[PDB]
Structure formats: C-alpha cells, structure tokens
Amino acid sequence: SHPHPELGRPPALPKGGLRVTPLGGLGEIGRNMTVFEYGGRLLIVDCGVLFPEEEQPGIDLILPDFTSIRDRLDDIEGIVLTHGHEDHIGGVPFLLREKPDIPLIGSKLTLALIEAKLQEHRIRPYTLEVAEGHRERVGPFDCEFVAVNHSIPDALAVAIRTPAGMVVHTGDFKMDQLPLDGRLTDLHAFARLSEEGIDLLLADSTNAEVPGFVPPERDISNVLRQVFANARKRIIVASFASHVHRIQQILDAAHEYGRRVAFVGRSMVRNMGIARDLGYLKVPPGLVVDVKTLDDLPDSEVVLVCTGSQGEPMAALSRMANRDHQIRIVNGDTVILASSLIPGNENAVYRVINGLTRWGANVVHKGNAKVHVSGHASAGELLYFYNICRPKNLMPVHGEWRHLRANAELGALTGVPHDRIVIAEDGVVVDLVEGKAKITGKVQAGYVYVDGLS
C-alpha cells in the first residue's frame, strides 16, 4: 500500500491528463512543494524548507530537489503560495535564484512576508495578489482561491481547473467556527465546488491521527487571562513570530490587566510589524512600547512577547534560559510557551524550560495549561470536510506516513473508494487521466542542503 520500490520514470503524460508531483511534504513534514503539469506547462503550489534534526556544521536548511523541474524552468507558469509559513515559502528564494521572473501568486500577507524574505536575497519578484473568491487564469491553469482558517492569517486553498478536471489543494487548514478575524474556512465555496465536481482533493494530514475537534483559538484567551490575573511580576510570552491571532490575544490580555507590551526578537519584530502595518493585528493605542523602556516599568506592568518557543538556541527564550540575554530571568517571572512542541524539538524545548525553571520562573506551557491549539484539522474536521467536498480521488498530503494513512482512512469512511485514494511519497508521480488518479512513475526527490549559498 506504499509506492512500488522500483518505480521507473513516468511515461509521457497523455493528452488531456493532469500530472501531480509532490517534491516535498510527504513522509517528512516540511519543505512542501507540489508540481502540477498540464499540456507541458507547470504550476507550482508552495515551495518550502525543512529544518534539520540536528545537524550542526554545514547544514542550515533542507530544500526540495528541483532536479525534475530545473531543465524546464521556462515551463513554470507561476508559484502559488497558500500561506506565509517557512515550510511553504522558505524555498522560494532558492527557486527564484534560478529563474527570477516566475510570478508569485498569493494573499496580501503571504506576499508581504515572502517579499520581506526575498529582499534579504536581493530579489524582487513579479507578484499577483489574490484574495478569496478571485479567479485567475495562469497558463492552462484556471485558479479559484478559497478562504481557509489557520495558525497564520490570510491563508488560501486553491481550486485548479483544467480539461483534466478540478483539483482542490487545501493548503494547511483547520475549521475554527469562531476565528478572531471572523474569517471562516469557506465551506460554502467547497460545497459549490463539490457540486461542480472535485476530481482530486489534496488534503492536510498533519492532525488526522487526532480524534475529535480542535478547540477554538479564543479559548486560549481564558487561560491567558487566568495566568495574567495571577502573575505578580513580569510576564514573558513565547510564540511563533507568525501567529498573529495568538499574539492578538496576548495584547488583549495585557491591555485588560494594565500591562505594556514589548516585542523581542528579529522575526517577531519584523512580522508583528508587517501584521500591524497591514491591519491583521489590532493594537490599542499606548499598549506596545520599545523593550528599552521596560527597565523603567514596574515588573507587574510588563509583558515581553519574544521568540524561540521551540528551544532555538540563538533565540530570546533560550539565551534568557542560558543567562545570555539583556533580559535576565528572576525568581517570580512568569513565562508562557504559547505554542506547540514540534516533535523532535522536545530536547531543546525541555532544556529551555528547565533553564527557566532553574532561575526561578514559573513556566506555563501546553503540558500544564491549554495555551495552544493546533493549526490543522483533526479527524472530526476532516470528516466534516470530506463529507462536504466529496472528492472523486483523494491524495493525503502534508504528513509523515502515519498521518497520511490516517487521513486516507478518514476519506475511506466518508465514502471515497479505496482504489481512488492514493498515498504518495516525495517524488511520486500521480496522473489524473479520464477522472481517475493513478501512480504512474517517480522522479528524483532526495534532500538538498543549503548554507544560504547552497
């Protein structure tokens, strides 16, 4: 039930067929990249990086292998960016380095983030900003964009129409029914699409092993308020620099309890800068201040929103825990790790927590408080979703093998036929011919290591 060990190169793509090829995100979560082919032309959905398990000198980032598209960069009609996370957009500078006039298609915030990253590489891309509801033709690919709710604002699924049929790519999504910005995952859109006919659905598998439903983000507010209410000294909150809604809730609590907020960390400052700038983050006047002024403030009036929720040794939280930061942890400080614990980072995270605890901090985290909810649909949501989309072929994407198999089983339960559910690996080539999806070959899709110069 896996791809055949020796799959040759794929045959010619039949006239009228579509060819889908995950170059990343399958078997190992990250460096997500999917290549769509129709009539010799290529559409790329996401191009991200993957963060290495260790691996110290000479290995900063891991990219998708561009081998199967490098000899045909001229065929690429565009790169669609479903949302602004690094394992979806982090690879773009290394792809554009090889052909800089490939157009980036994406939401406003998505584009602003990727443009910020590209600036550091001296690259200015051609872009096409889209919003939910926009429909646009990109070479042979007719792209309609659909709102999805998630850990970052402004994320899109995309429905791609060709004469091979309609392919829906969900990007990353969950289904919060009470999102901070009122922006729901557009089930109306999906239902309409489903009545037109969804021939191949590529769906987020990240949380498919998890039963039930993701608690709504707004529940976190309660916990934050409890923590804030009982915190007699400074509060330090760590989160991913892109989690705008999370941070929104931290400012909300800060305001409620008469505290001032300062952002610490390059990424955090940059991103909250962009989010605030474009209206995604709503900040009441007088709340946010420079970190330098925090010295002048009483402890009980101070909230630091900083960086390094995954124990990244160069980030704020870690250096604080290692007594190597301008900010010095003291007995009585409250630290909240308002984040996930990505598998593999347990050593680093726990080391940070132990350091913090050692210096006298009370540390709130997902292990002792409900201060984080997943960004991805659980088994419950996925069932809701499959019952609305009713895909005719299903490809689980974005997960380790256990995740994909889970997602596959859910699809099965909703009535997707087993022979129409295809589990792929990086480099496995799926052809949508005559409305059926079949594994037809595989291409080179190993790992590629980069130091910023590759």
Add this chain to the structure above:
RNA sequence: CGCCU
C-alpha cells in the same frame, strides 16, 4: 508540524 538570526 514551523524556525531562528
């Protein structure tokens, strides 16, 4: 289940 600088 996405870094960080």
